[PDB]
Amino acid sequence: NAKLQTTVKVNEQVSTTTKSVEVPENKDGVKVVDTLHYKGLVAGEKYEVKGTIYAVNGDNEEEVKETKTAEFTADASGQGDWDLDFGSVKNLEAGKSYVVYEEVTSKENLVDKDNNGTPDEKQTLEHKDPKDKAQIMVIKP
Structure with a gap:
């Protein structure tokens, strides 16, 4: 029922479903923000988010480059956006691609899974798609 999509932004460039951003290499830092587009969450509840940036070659994820955790609150309508700011991310190398993965878990127990x-x-969402262009950045010279 609940759905999570994501959009990575590098500096001011924004990845879309049809086009991953091509970012000029800056090993001293590029600013990375991932927007979590969520639907079907419980209004006013807190959620713990863990975002991860991986080097990605095909469907195979290589090393983790960066991790960022945060606590957000679900909108009144149970759908909306959260921005997870990775800050300045170092040593993203030209010729490589990087993908953002997201893991979302409610602070509180919300689901009656045992039918009692x-x-x-906890209500849990994830978006761990290595082929989702909207979550991918491509580094270029």
């Missing part, structure tokens, strides 16, 4: 009338499980 009581929330007993």
Whole structure:
């Protein structure tokens, strides 16, 4: 029911579903922000987010380059955007591609998974797509 899509922004360049940003190499730092587009969350609840940047060659993810955790609050309508700011990310190398993965977990138990009338499980979302262009940056010279 709940869905998570993501959009990576590098400096002012924004990846889309049809076009990953091609970013001129700057090993001293490029600013990376990932927007989480969520739907189907519980209004006003806190959620813990863990974002990861991986070097990606095909479907195979290589090393983790960067990690960032944060706590957000779900919009009143249970759908909206969160910005996870990785800050200045170093040593993204020309000729390589990097993908952002997101993991979302409610602070509180919200799901009655055991069908006992009581929330007993956290609501969990994830977007870990190595082929999602919207979450990919390509570094160029």
